[PDB]
Each structure stands twice: as structure tokens, then as C-alpha cells.
Design an enzyme around this catalytic site. Structure first.
Site, PDB file in Angstrom:
ATOM      1  CB  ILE A  16      -1.076   0.013   1.119  1.00 14.93           C
ATOM      2  CG1 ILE A  16      -0.457  -0.302   2.493  1.00 14.93           C
ATOM      3  CG2 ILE A  16      -2.227  -0.936   0.774  1.00 14.93           C
ATOM      4  CD1 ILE A  16      -1.103   0.381   3.632  1.00 14.93           C
ATOM      5  N   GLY A  17       2.116   1.177   0.377  1.00 14.77           N
ATOM      6  CA  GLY A  17       3.020   2.319   0.442  1.00 14.77           C
ATOM      7  C   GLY A  17       4.411   1.990  -0.042  1.00 14.77           C
ATOM      8  CB  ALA A  18       9.631   2.130   5.153  1.00  9.59           C
ATOM      9  CE  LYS A  19       8.468  -3.383  -1.596  1.00  6.80           C
ATOM     10  NZ  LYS A  19       8.390  -2.693  -2.910  1.00  6.80           N
ATOM     11  CB  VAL A  20       3.306   0.236   4.246  1.00  6.64           C
ATOM     12  CG1 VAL A  20       2.249  -0.320   5.217  1.00  6.64           C
ATOM     13  CG2 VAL A  20       4.202   1.251   4.957  1.00  6.64           C
ATOM     14  CE  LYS A  35       8.438   2.440   9.192  1.00  6.57           C
ATOM     15  NZ  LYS A  35       8.180   3.708   9.921  1.00  6.57           N
ATOM     16  CG  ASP A 122       8.492  14.176  10.067  1.00  4.60           C
ATOM     17  OD1 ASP A 122       8.107  15.267   9.567  1.00  4.60           O
ATOM     18  OD2 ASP A 122       8.770  13.177   9.382  1.00  4.60           O
TER      19      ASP A 122
HETATM   20  C1  LIG Z   1       0.816   3.451   3.591  1.00  8.95           C
HETATM   21  C2  LIG Z   1       0.717   4.588   4.620  1.00  8.95           C
HETATM   22  C3  LIG Z   1      -0.747   4.856   5.027  1.00  8.95           C
HETATM   23  C4  LIG Z   1       1.667   4.341   5.802  1.00  8.95           C
HETATM   24  O1  LIG Z   1       1.153   3.297   6.649  1.00  8.95           O
HETATM   25  C5  LIG Z   1       1.709   3.027   7.886  1.00  8.95           C
HETATM   26  C6  LIG Z   1       2.979   3.521   8.306  1.00  8.95           C
HETATM   27  N1  LIG Z   1       3.493   3.303   9.531  1.00  8.95           N
HETATM   28  C7  LIG Z   1       2.782   2.558  10.409  1.00  8.95           C
HETATM   29  C8  LIG Z   1       1.516   2.030  10.111  1.00  8.95           C
HETATM   30  C9  LIG Z   1       0.967   2.229   8.815  1.00  8.95           C
HETATM   31  C10 LIG Z   1      -0.382   1.692   8.517  1.00  8.95           C
HETATM   32  C11 LIG Z   1      -1.298   1.126   9.444  1.00  8.95           C
HETATM   33  N2  LIG Z   1      -2.426   0.783   8.855  1.00  8.95           N
HETATM   34  N3  LIG Z   1      -2.295   1.129   7.546  1.00  8.95           N
HETATM   35  C12 LIG Z   1      -3.355   0.951   6.613  1.00  8.95           C
HETATM   36  C13 LIG Z   1      -4.245  -0.133   6.770  1.00  8.95           C
HETATM   37  C14 LIG Z   1      -5.283  -0.352   5.845  1.00  8.95           C
HETATM   38  C15 LIG Z   1      -5.487   0.511   4.731  1.00  8.95           C
HETATM   39  N4  LIG Z   1      -6.533   0.280   3.790  1.00  8.95           N
HETATM   40  C16 LIG Z   1      -7.466   1.417   3.576  1.00  8.95           C
HETATM   41  C17 LIG Z   1      -8.667   1.109   2.635  1.00  8.95           C
HETATM   42  N5  LIG Z   1      -9.249  -0.195   2.992  1.00  8.95           N
HETATM   43  C18 LIG Z   1     -10.496  -0.446   2.283  1.00  8.95           C
HETATM   44  C19 LIG Z   1      -8.262  -1.240   2.700  1.00  8.95           C
HETATM   45  C20 LIG Z   1      -7.100  -1.089   3.707  1.00  8.95           C
HETATM   46  C21 LIG Z   1      -4.580   1.601   4.566  1.00  8.95           C
HETATM   47  C22 LIG Z   1      -3.549   1.832   5.515  1.00  8.95           C
HETATM   48  C23 LIG Z   1      -1.051   1.664   7.327  1.00  8.95           C
END
Ligand SMILES: CC(C)COc1cnccc1-c1cnn(-c2ccc(N3CCN(C)CC3)cc2)c1
Length: 303
Positions: A16-17, A18-20, A35, A122
Site C-alpha cells: 500500500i506504500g 520503507a515499503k508498507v 513496514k 515530524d
Molecule cells: C501506507 C501509509 C498509510 C503508511 O502506513 C503506515 C505507516 N506506519 C505505520 C503504520 C501504517 C499503517 C497502518 N495501517 N495502515 C493501513 C491499513 C489499511 C489501509 N486500507 C485502507 C482502505 N481499505 C479499504 C483497505 C485497507 C490503509 C492503511 C497503514
């Protein structure tokens, strides 16, 4: 080689996103965010040390740290409500009332961080995520100690500073963005932005109330010694409006107290007795046992 150990505990989903990467903890069925950091492409150690010592209702929880030859994995609390940055844009701007709802949560997390002897350094809407209950979770403690648009004048200048004072300035910028939907100091040119921040002058839109304006002046002082202290922010008249109680900054998420139901649920997966199990969880190694315990507590909170 890099994902072998991780795959024993998690079923991986989408990047969805360091790579996430999103994932599912096999034992509990709970969703997590993982992460992933490349050790030879890089801050990781800073964030880990801090997060192991911070545990709070408004801080994105660290569950598990795994390390290989090339990677460090951090398994974290699932925040499907997305970024506060995207939320503000989608709404254009928030009313004073909705700003107060979200700001009191930011104040809660930041005051606790300072109480633990840290400064975030930050703070910005990309670093605040909503969970499934529409509650905010503070992320990215990589720059923490014991972005340019949100940085305090002294921090940019390379002057000595107190992290708590830099956080209060960043919170002032956040408060403005929440109620306006645009930055108080903005420019396409980095040097012209730097000039604007040092000057500390910003436009005051017609929709801001007198009390909102006064709180902004108290946080947005170029002189850090003139900035409001965190303690006075907790029970500030603007903060208290429609609430009549100071911000609850103390953590509701303990290191000491264990939940009997989750210790019971966790124990069926191990060959040890009750006391041995509790003693092992209490060591907080951020291993698979830590992850299982904390995810069982999140499963229980849903019901
Ligand atoms: C990529 C960035 C947002 C950075 O993320 C992080 C960075 N450092 C710590 C934690 C996170 C983190 C924690 N939860 N999520 C996250 C969980 C679920 C979802 N979707 C949303 C829409 N839905 C329908 C499907 C799932 C999106 C984001 C990201």
C-alpha cells in the site's frame, strides 16, 4: 531468504506504500500493516527503541520486530481509515467542532510522548492515521529524539532547540491546516518558504473564530520561549470548549497489567503453564508472543 521467517506468522496481502504491506496474523486472523526496511538502502533503530517504550491509545502500536540479513520488518496496528492528510482534502476543511474532536486526540498522543522523555519532531497530517473506530494513531517515530512546511523556525536554521517546543509549533501548523485546508506558510520555492516561516506571518481566513485565532497565535510564535507549554494546552479554553474536561493524555494501554481473557486465549497455543506464560508476555520482546498477545487484545476490544 528475506520473507521466510515472516511467512511462518503472517499471510501477506497488497503493498500500500520503507515499503508498507498489509497482512493477516495467522494465529488470530487479525489484520496488520507491515513496514519493510532494506538495511543496505538506508532511523530504523531510533523508531524501534522509541516504539518499544511507547504504548498509548493514540499511537500506532508496534507488535513485532523481525530482522534478516537484508531487512527489518515492523508489524504494526491496522489503521484502515487512512491518512488525516487525505481526510482533510476529501472534506476541503473541517469545522471548528470537528477540528477539536481530532486535535484533542493529537494533543493526547503528543503530551504522552513528551511525558515519556521523547519529542516526535515530524508532526504532520501524513503521520496521523484513522483506525476502524475513526480514532487517530500517530506514526513514524524515525526522526524522534530523547516536513519543511511543518518545521519550527529554529529547527530549519540549525539552531539548538527543545523537541517539545518544535512539536508545539508543528501542532500549530496542523491546527491551521485542519480548519483551513491549506498551509499557513507555503511557496513553490524552498528559499521563499524558509523566508515565510522565519517571518511567522500568515493569512487569517474570515471563517476562523476569535478563540481559534488566539490559540493559533499561542502555538505559532517564532520565539520558542513564547510558545504555549504542553501542560497549558491540555486545559486551554479553546480545547475545553464543548468538553469541560482537560485532554486525557495518560495511556490506557499498559505494560504491567495483563488481560486474563487474552492470557487464557494465548495459553492454548503454548505447552507452558499460566505463570510461565504471564512471565514470558511481561518480558515484551516484540517477538511472535508479543504480537499474539496484543492482537488478541485488539480482537477483544472489537467485541
Ligand atoms: C501506507 C501509509 C498509510 C503508511 O502506513 C503506515 C505507516 N506506519 C505505520 C503504520 C501504517 C499503517 C497502518 N495501517 N495502515 C493501513 C491499513 C489499511 C489501509 N486500507 C485502507 C482502505 N481499505 C479499504 C483497505 C485497507 C490503509 C492503511 C497503514
Amino acid at each position: 531468504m528475506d520473507y521466510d521467517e515472516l511467512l511462518k506468522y503472517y499471510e501477506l496481502h497488497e503493498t500500500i506504500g520503507a515499503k508498507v504491506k498489509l497482512a493477516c496474523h495467522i494465529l488470530t486472523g487479525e489484520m496488520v500493516a507491515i513496514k519493510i526496511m532494506d538495511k543496505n538502502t538506508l532511523r530504523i533503530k531510533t523508531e524501534i527503541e522509541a516504539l518499544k517504550n511507547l504504548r498509548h491509545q493514540h499511537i500506532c502500536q508496534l507488535y513485532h520486530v523481525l530482522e534478516t540479513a537484508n531487512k527489518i520488518f515492523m508489524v504494526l496496528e491496522y489503521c484502515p481509515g487512512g491518512e488525516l492528510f487525505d481526510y482533510i482534502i476529501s472534506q476541503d476543511r473541517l469545522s471548528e467542532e470537528e477540528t477539536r474532536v481530532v486535535f484533542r486526540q493529537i494533543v493526547s498522543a503528543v503530551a504522552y510522548v513528551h511525558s515519556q522523555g521523547y519529542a516526535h519532531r515530524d508532526l504532520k497530517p501524513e503521520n496521523l492515521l484513522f483506525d476502524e473506530y475513526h480514532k487517530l494513531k500517530l506514526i513514524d517515530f524515525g526522526l524522534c529524539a530523547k516536513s519543511l512546511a511543518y518545521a519550527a523556525p529554529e529547527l530549519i536554521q540549525g539552531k539548538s532547540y527543545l523537541g517539545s517546543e518544535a512539536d508545539v509549533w508543528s501542532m500549530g501548523i496542523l491546527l491551521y491546516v485542519l480548519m483551513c485546508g491549506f498551509l499557513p506558510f507555503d511557496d513553490d520555492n524552498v528559499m521563499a518558504l524558509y523566508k515565510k516561516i522565519m517571518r511567522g506571518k500568515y493569512d487569517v481566513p474570515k471563517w476562523l473564530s476569535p478563540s481559534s485565532i488566539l490559540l493559533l497565535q499561542q502555538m505559532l510564535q517564532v520565539d520558542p520561549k513564547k510558545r504555549i507549554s504542553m501542560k497549558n494546552l491540555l486545559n486551554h479554553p479553546w480545547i475545553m470548549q464543548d468538553y469541560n474536561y482537560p485532554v486525557e493524555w495518560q495511556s490506557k494501554n499498559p505494560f504491567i497489567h495483563l488481560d486474563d481473557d487474552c492470557v487464557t486465549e494465548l495459553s492454548v497455543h503454548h505447552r507452558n503453564n499460566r505463570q510461565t506464560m504471564e512471565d514470558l508476555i511481561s518480558l515484551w520482546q516484540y517477538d511472535h508472543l508479543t504480537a499474539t498477545y496484543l492482537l488478541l487484545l485488539a480482537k477483544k476490544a472489537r467485541g
